[model samples]
Target chain A: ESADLRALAKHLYDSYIKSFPLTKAKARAILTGKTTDKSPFVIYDMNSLMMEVAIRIFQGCQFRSVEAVQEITEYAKSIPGFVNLDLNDQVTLLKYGVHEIIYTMLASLMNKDGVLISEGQGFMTREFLKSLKPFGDFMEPKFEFAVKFNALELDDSDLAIFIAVIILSGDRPGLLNVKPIEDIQDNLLQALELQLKLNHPESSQLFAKLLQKMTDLRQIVTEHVQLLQVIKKTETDMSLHPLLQEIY
Target chain B: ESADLRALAKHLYDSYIKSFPLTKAKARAILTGKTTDKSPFVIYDMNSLMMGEVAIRIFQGCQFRSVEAVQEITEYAKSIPGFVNLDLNDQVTLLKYGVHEIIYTMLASLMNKDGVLISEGQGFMTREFLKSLRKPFGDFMEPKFEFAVKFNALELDDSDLAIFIAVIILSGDRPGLLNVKPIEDIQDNLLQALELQLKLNHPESSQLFAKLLQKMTDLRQIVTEHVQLLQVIKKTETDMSLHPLLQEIYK
Candidate 1:
C-alpha cells in the first residue's frame, strides 16, 4: 500500500512531468530556485474548460475575424441574456485567465531571480505583478509561514484556487500574511501543488498533442484545460475529507 | 402569301385538332350528345395577362411547379416570414392549370362541336362540378379560357397570332355574345377559338413529341405557362419587351 501510494504518486508525478513540464519547471523555480527566500507562491487555479464554454459563444466565428466574433456574440448573447460583451471585454477576460496560467508558470520558473514579470489585460496586469514584487521582504525565515490569501472566482485551477487556499489556511487579511504554522502550510501547499501538477500536466499534454494535429484544435484544447479546472472544483468538494486527512 | 397563312392556319387548326379530340368528343357527348339546343355559345375572354403585373404573378407558379414546385415552396415558407401556403391551394392550382391544357387538347380533336367546352378545372372531380351547380340556370356557358390564355401567354404560333389579332379586334374580351352584331360576334368567337385551339396544342404536345421521338429534335421549350405568365407581368413594367405582341390593342 505504501508503495502503491508512491506508485500512484509517481505515475501522477511522471504524467505531470510529461504533460505540464511548463508548470513543473515554474513550480520548481518558484519553490527551490537559487534563492534564500522560502515563501510559498500563492495562486488561484481557474477552470480552463469553463473558459472554453465562454469560448463557445464565439463558435460561430471559429477562425473568423473580430467582426464575425461580434456578430456571433450578439446572437449568442441574445440566447438568454448573456450580455452582449464587447470584443475588447471578451479579449480582456480571456487574456486574464491565460496570463494567470502564464504567471503561475513564470513564478515557478523565476525562482532564483525572484523577479516575476506578469502579462495580462485589464486590472490583473498590475495586480499580478504586485503579488510577486515582495520577494525581498518575504525572504526572512520568520515569514516562512506567511500565508498569501487570494480570492478568485474561476476557482478550479487559476488565481482563485491559489488565493482561497491561502486565505482559508492562514486566516490572513492584509496582502497574504504568514500561516503561523509553517508545517501545516507547507504540507497544504505541497499537496495542492502535487494535485495540480498531476491534473494540469495531463491537460497541457493533451492540448499540445491536439495542437500538433490541427492548429484549429489548439483553441479547443486550451479550452479543455479551462473546463477541467471548473469541473475539478465539484470533484474536490466531494473528496475534501480524505484530502484534509492526507495533509494532517 | 394567302396559302402560307392558310397553311399556318391549318397547321394551327390541326395542332388543336390532334390534341383535343378526346375532350372535344366528350364535350359534344355531354350536352349536344343528348339535347337539341341550337343557340350559339358565348365566351368572356378575360385577358388577365393584359392586367398590370398579371403575367408575372401567374407564370411564377407554373414554371416553378414543373421544377419541383413543392420543394421550393416548402423551403421558402420555412424561411422567416415566408407565407408557406401548405394547404393544397398551390397543388390544386397547378393541377387545374395542367388539366385545363389536357381538356382543351381533347376538345380540339372533335368534329361537329362548333364551340369547344371551355370548362376551367380539368374534368369533373365531382366536388368541382357540384360547386358550379349553384350557378345561374344549369345552362351556363362557362368560358374555360385556360389553354387559350396559356397559348396566348406562350405566344405559340402564327395561328395564335391570327387569334391574337381577333382578340384585339374584340377589345381583349371574348368576342362571342348574344344580341351582339353578327360580324363582330363571329370575329371574336373565331379569334377566341383559334387561341383556344393553339393553347390546347402548344407545349404539352411538344413535350409529348419530344418524349416520343426522344432521338430527333432537341425542342427548346419555353418556361411553363406559369413562368410565362410571370414573365409577361415582369416584362410589362420594364422596357425590355422580350415577348411578342399578338394584338396591338393599345398603341
Candidate 2:
C-alpha cells in the first residue's frame, strides 16, 4: 500500500512537473510588468494587454489540460484498478472526470499567491488576476482552492496518488456501472491512507484534509466553468481553441 | 432542402421559447430596480447593484412549463433518424448533451443585444437588466448573449439551424458512449447534410460550415457554464429548486 506506489508517485510528479519549465526570468518579467521582443512571451500593446492575458491564460490552461490528460492516461494504464476496468468504463471515467483531474493537477502549477503563467516564466499575482475585466472574478475560486490545497504541503508522492484517486472517481453523476471502479478507487485510497500515515506521522487528519481537497477541486472547477461562461458571453474577439473548448 | 426541416426547427424553437411567459410590468420594474408588492420579484439587500432585468429575463427564459414541452422536444429529437439509430446508452448520452446544446441554439436564434424574446415580440427583456442580477447568477447569463450574438451573425436559416442542431445531437463524443464509430458516422452525415444545405442556401459563404462547427464548440462551452451556474444556484439559493430532470441532467 505504501512503498512501491509512493516511489511511483514521486517519479510521476518529478517528470510531470518538469515537463513545464518555470523560468525565473519570465516570472520576474511579469511581476515587473515587462515583455520582450520574443515570440511567445511578447506583449503587443497595452490596449490588448487584457486580451493577451486572457489568451495566455486560456492557451496555457488548454495546453496543460491536453498534456495532463495524455500523461494521466498513460499513467492510469499502469494502475491495476484503472487498466483492469472495461475499456468503455475507463473511457467514461476519464471523459467525465478529466476536467476535474486537470484542475487538481493545476495545483501543481500554483502557489499560495497565484498560478504560474507563460510556461512557468511568469507568476500571476492573485491581486492582479482578480483585477482583470470580465474574467477577474472567474479566476478567484481557482486561486482560492489552489492556495489552500498547496498549504497541505503534500510532497510529490502524495500529490501523485491524490491525482490517481481523483481520476478513478466512481461517484461522478453519470456512471451506469460503478462497482468495478469503486473497487479500484478503494485500493488507491487505502494505499494513500497508508502512505500518509508513514509519511506524516504527526498529522492524524492529513488524509481527511486531502479528501476534502477533492471536494474543493470540484467547486473550483465549477467556478472555472462559470468563468468560461463569462468569456463566452463577452469576448467575441477572444476565440477559444476548438481543442480546449471541447475539453470542457 | 428548406421547407420541412425549417418548419420543424422554427416550430420547435417557437414552442420551446413560448414555454416561458413574459410580464412587461415586471420587465420594467427590474430595469428600474423597483420591486412591487404585487409581483413575485423579491430583491434581497445584497448591495450588489446589478440590473434586475437579467434575473427577470433568465427567470422568465428558464420557466420551462409543461411536461408536454419535454415530450415534444424528446419526440422531435427521436424524429431525427441519425439520433434514433444510435445505441440506447449512446442515444441517452447524446440527448443529454444535445438538449442543452439545442437550447443554446434556440437562444442564439431568438436573441438580440437588448434581450431574448421571452414571448416573441410581446416581451423584450433588456440585456442591461440581466447583467445587473446578483453575483454568480448575473454572471451566468452574460455568456449566452455573447454566444447568441456571434452565432446569429452566421445568419443560418431554420433549415441550416435544424441540421446543425441535429449534428450537435449526434456528434457523440460525449463520455460513456459505447460506440463512437457509429455515432461519429451519424454526426458526419449530418455535417455533410448541413454543408450541402448551406451551399444551396447561402451559395457564396464557403466558410459557413466551418464557422458553424466552430459555433458548436462555443455552444458547448456556454452550456458547460450554464450547468455550473445551476450547480451554484442549487448550492446557494435554498428557496430555488431545480426540476427533477434538470437535477438529474446537471447531476
Q: Residue by residue across A1-248, what tens digits does model 1's lDDT show?
A: 23433343344344333433234334444443434544443332223122332223223112322332333333222221113333443334333333223333323334322332221100112222233322212222111111111101112233222322222222122322232322333333333444444555533212111111122122233444454466445434445457433532
Off by over 4 Å in 1: A1-248, B21-26, B34-129, B132-251
What is candidate 1's TM-score against the reference? 0.15
- TM-scores, in order shown? 0.15, 0.43
In terms of lDDT, the poorest run of 10 residues in model 2 chain B is B40-49
Candidate 2: tens digits of C-alpha lDDT, residues A8-55: 556555644544343233343444334665323333234534556755
Q: Note the Cα lDDT for every prediction shown.
A: 0.30, 0.61
Output the lDDT of residue A186, model 2.
64
Error of 2 at A99 (Å): 16
